[model samples]
Target: MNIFEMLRIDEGLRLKIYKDTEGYYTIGIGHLLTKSPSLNAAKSELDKAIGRNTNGVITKDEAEKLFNQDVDAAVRGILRNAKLKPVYDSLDAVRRAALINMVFQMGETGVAGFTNSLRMLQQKRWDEAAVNLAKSRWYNQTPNRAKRVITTFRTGTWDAYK
Candidate 1:
């Protein structure tokens, strides 16, 4: 399974990623996220990205690859975009990873659009960061996933790795 398949993001999240060509290309990795066949088509490519077989489940390799790809995309595309560069560069790994989790679920452009959360992260305001993180239109979009990431940001447990 790919990242979106693993995350099990709802229609909203999946819709966001599938909406853009480049986002679809990178987010889908070697296949298209929106296409049924693409999901299975890139399994081999995903195998290499992740490193372990999922045994027809979501193999460890698939999970790790999706996680790393999502993080990298968040850093390089979502966070590093012109308006987000300064804010993203200032975050610690824990916070950065949490945001990556958010972006993974929410999609690049959507996450970059969180003006207030970006400010909170830029200022290193943890409380505001958590609050801002929770207050997105994407909040209820993926409650379980959002909670995990929120807990990670709040407690720095690297939860998305879970």
Candidate 2:
């Protein structure tokens, strides 16, 4: 029922490097191995970081560390945004987890850009907020992710994790 649990289910665990749906070099629960546009560079970085002899695989423990760290960054980044803080502070824990999931996907700018949704969410307008979020490009880009997040926001359930 925690953010980590929700993300693990949403993202799926990866012990080895792989291309994401967008062909980005990602690993260990969607962690970006390299932002470099070069495939050669990304492969090299992955090989180097994960170590040569290990055949480009990471331990579950290693992935867990990155997952926890990345989740923490998203949580902190959301609060650091000037406008998101007050809205974030007003929500219950479950709703806040939904915010973190969105932030985890698109970063703070993307989450903050949901001006209408944020207001609806802050005012505890679950349906309006869910509808507002549904209209977003982000939702269209990843319907399942947005649906799960919205479900959590709407029902205030830890159902996203389940």
Candidate 3:
């Protein structure tokens, strides 16, 4: 799976700060707050998960490592839960990577919402598939990224816009 590309969908290419659903201070690609020493061995585990000593700041490199682990696991779960291996294996690497990235951004069910685009992809209508991608709400929300992904779909190249 294209871990960096998947990260681009959520973590971006830099550090980000936000509050997770639990309202804990989070930074990087979903790294949660784990500074409490109330536990015993869990403290070290938290330290390992955090991977830094700052208040909550995370470097791009650190976040990349964390994202690699986290997003890779998410990819596996999405693939298994959705039973998408057959369709996933039918596409080229670039398109497969794009689907995996989309699954990371939107859940497996959300990616499944792109029925037309997925159908176009399955039928190998490259331009139609690219145009279909542009028709999504995701494309309207992030045109630049959608364009990049569309470029990848059209050319089947991993580094279309890069």
Candidate 4:
């Protein structure tokens, strides 16, 4: 099952995966991620501190920082609400990677909420998908960044997609 699918709440209360409070995000005030040479180790420590063993763990700060990393790495970790496994399983690596990047940047709910884009993706209409990708508010808001991704996604080989 999608990790984020599990994050949804029956009541109005949100089941927070990462808490957004101040300058940074920790795993529920236990873990903290920062810039370091051994970023992986830092992430592990943060995970432990925050008591989060799986993905979908981070504060808004971490999320923002993560997305600012190289596109591939940024996308791999947080796409679809950080529910990477099932989504990865369902898609070819190229599409999976691209979608992961998109979701990481836009959040799972935001990416999935794109009705036409999602439909185009489901239909495997590459051109249509690419068109829809650039139509979002986020795309309009961040043209330079989105343009790079759009160019990569459109003219790129499968390898480029990832």
| Top candidate (lDDT) | 2
Steric clash pairs (candidate 3): none
- Give a tens-digit lDDT track for model 3, residues 71-157: 675568556754455557678877777777667555677777677887788788889999888988888876776777777777788
Clashing pairs in 1: 50-61, 51-61, 52-61, 54-59
lDDT tens string, model 1, 1-162?
A: 223433443212221123232343223332234333454544444455446542223534444456556556766775457656776578665666666556665567877788887887787777778787887656665566677666666666654445
TM-score (all chains, Cα) for each model: 0.56, 0.88, 0.67, 0.44
73: Cα error in model 1, Å: 2.8
Question: Where is model 3 more than 4 Å wrong at Cα?
Answer: 1-11, 16-26, 29-55, 59-61, 81-83
The residue-by-residue lDDT of candidate 2 on 12-83, one tens digit each, is 998887877667777788777776767677767767655564455788987787788789999999889987
Positional deviation of residue 99's Cα in model 3 after best superposition, in angstroms: 1.4
| Per-residue lDDT value at 12 in model 2 | 92
| lDDT digits (tens) for residues 30-108 of candidate 4 | 2224434454655575665446664544565554333234244435444434344454455554456456556544556
Better of 2 and 3 by TM-score: 2
Superposition TM-score, candidate 3 onto the true structure: 0.67
The lDDT per prediction is: 0.55, 0.83, 0.64, 0.48
Which pairs in model 4 have colliding backbones? 30-49, 30-50, 31-49, 31-50
- lDDT comparison, 2 vs 4, better candidate: 2
